Amino acid sequence: GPGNDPISQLQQCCLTLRTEGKEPDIPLYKTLQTVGPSHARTYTVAVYFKGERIGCGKGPSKKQAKMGAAMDALEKYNFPQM
Numbered sequence: 001g002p003g004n005d006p007i008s009q010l011q012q013c014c015l016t017l018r019t020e021g022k023e024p025d026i027p028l029y030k031t032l033q034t035v036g037p038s039h040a041r042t043y044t045v046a047v048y049f050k051g052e053r054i055g056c057g058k059g060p061s062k063k064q065a066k067m068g069a070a071m072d073a074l075e076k077y078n079f080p081q082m
Contacts, residue, residue: 008070014078045069
């Protein structure tokens with residue numbers, strides 16, 4: 001349906017967040033923990049930025065999980081400001 005176009009691609013730039021006057025940082029997305037070992041194995045990942053969660057998702061695979069995590073950040077909007 002949506003095709004092979006994970007939002008992680010766009011969010012990738014956000015992770016670095018290149019901004020003048022902003023302190024340097026290097027965030028990395030990696031499986032946090034697995035659950036449901038009894039039956040189907042699931043992977044849980046959470047992206048952290050500036051010491052705060054920016055996106056988080058879950059799925060039967062990292063590729064699927066990461067996609068959801070990136071999308072979550074997108075929905076929550078990066079660097080929220082009214």
